[PDB]
Amino acid sequence: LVHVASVEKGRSYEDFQKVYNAIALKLREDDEYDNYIGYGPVLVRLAWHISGTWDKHDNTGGSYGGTYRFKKEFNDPSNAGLQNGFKFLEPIHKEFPWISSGDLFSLGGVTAVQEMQGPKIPWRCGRVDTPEDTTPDNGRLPDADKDAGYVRTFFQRLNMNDREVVALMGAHALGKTHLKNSGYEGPGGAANNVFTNEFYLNLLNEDWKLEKNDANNEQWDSKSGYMMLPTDYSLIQDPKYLSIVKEYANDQDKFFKDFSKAFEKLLENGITFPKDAPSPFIFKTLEEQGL
């Protein structure tokens, strides 16, 4: 099962920078969403969930085919809430109808990370929409009520190692859990629409108490009003994860560089890029363009 990247006909860096810019401008404009968190976090989660269906064993799922647009995947219980991200991107797709769905969803996540002052994430075009019957069944995205061994084994299916898993999880500084979406409630820190290494600092420095929420699920709560999922907290229960948590808590630049690599890899799993494919694009932020 081979998915070969195919550049949208005649398109180049400038075309994709325009799509970036439209996403970034709408991120700025539609600022009220989710009690003024804005759409950044949900777009990052959308990019991850459309990628996280991948299975290295047979190359099913993954970002390439854009299959989130089909009802089976759109209505995955694991994807509850992501409809808000898709609705955000609808006017973008209308303005730029030539971009593939997988390119749009993945570019949304890259744009969100960068516009929230995160690391640059190199991004490659050429995902191609595939038919409805290529949509992966529900149940490939991870549960949150589990322990470190679960997390480790889960991410092996995505070809991610301990350092890549701990780096990716730093995205949980962003946005919040919403009780009605996932059965968990609250943010992981204070700056939840700015991309920082706060997730690791909060894991190490807050006083965490294991409580039940209003959906009768356990989660870890701090008196500052932050929360951790059981799978988040597992990163300080397992000694191998804990060492990497401490590394990223103590080195912002290292976290940014490792996140950027892991997130690009996540968004590109399953895709074969021709030797003659364009190099990865690194988009300028609005701020860098004076826009």
**Contact residues: ligand Nc1ccc(N)nc1, CB under 6 A:** 172, 175-177, 187-188, 227-229, 232
The terminus-to-terminus CA distance of the chain in angstroms comes to 42
Binding site partner of 227, from ligand HEM, ligand Nc1ccc(N)nc1, none, Cβ cut-off 5-8 A by kind: ligand Nc1ccc(N)nc1
Nearer to ligand Nc1ccc(N)nc1, 108 or 188 (CB): 188
Torsion from C-alpha of 145, 146, 150, 154, nearest 10 degrees: 10
Which tokens in the block code for residue 61? 């799922």
The item of ligand Nc1ccc(N)nc1, ligand HEM, none sharing an interface with residue 228, based on CB under 5 to 8 Å by kind, is: ligand Nc1ccc(N)nc1
Among 19, 42, 203, 228, binds ligand HEM (CB under 6 A): 42
Residue 77 DSSP SS3: helix
Does position 101 interact with ligand HEM (CB under 6 A)? The reply is: no
Q: Which residue is nearest to ligand Nc1ccc(N)nc1 (CB)?
A: 188
179 - beta bridge partners? none
> Which residues of the chain form beta strands (DSSP E)?
3-4, 176-177, 186-187, 208-212, 218-222, 227-228, 271-272
**Min CB(63)–ligand HEM separation in Å:** 13
Pairing status of strand 186-187 against strand 176-177:
antiparallel
How far apart CA 80 and CA 4 sit, in angstroms, is 30
Among 61, 81, 136, 186, indicate the residue that binds ligand HEM (CB under 6 A): 81
Give the Cα separation of 250 and 248 in Å (integer). 5
62 touches ligand HEM (CB under 6 A): no
89 is a site residue for ligand HEM (CB under 6 A): no
Q: Where are the alpha helices (DSSP H) in 170-229?
A: 179-182, 198-205
Q: Which residues pair with 194 in a beta bridge?
A: none
Count of positions on this chain that bind ligand HEM (CB under 6 A): 24
Q: Tell me the residue nearest to ligand HEM as measured from the CB.
A: 175
Q: Between residues 96 and 226, which has the closer beta carbon with respect to ligand Nc1ccc(N)nc1? A: 226
Min dist CB 81 to ligand HEM, Å, is 4
Query: Residue 122: which of 257, 6, 287 has the closest Cα?
Result: 257
- CA angle, corner 108, sides to 189 and 92, nearest 5? 130
Q: Which of 20, 48, 220, 283 binds ligand HEM (CB under 6 A)?
A: 48
Chain positions 137 to 156 lying near ligand HEM, rule: CB under 6 A, are 142, 144, 151
Point out which residues bind ligand HEM (CB under 6 A): 41-42, 44-45, 48, 81, 142, 144, 151, 168-169, 171-172, 174-178, 181-182, 184, 229, 231, 263
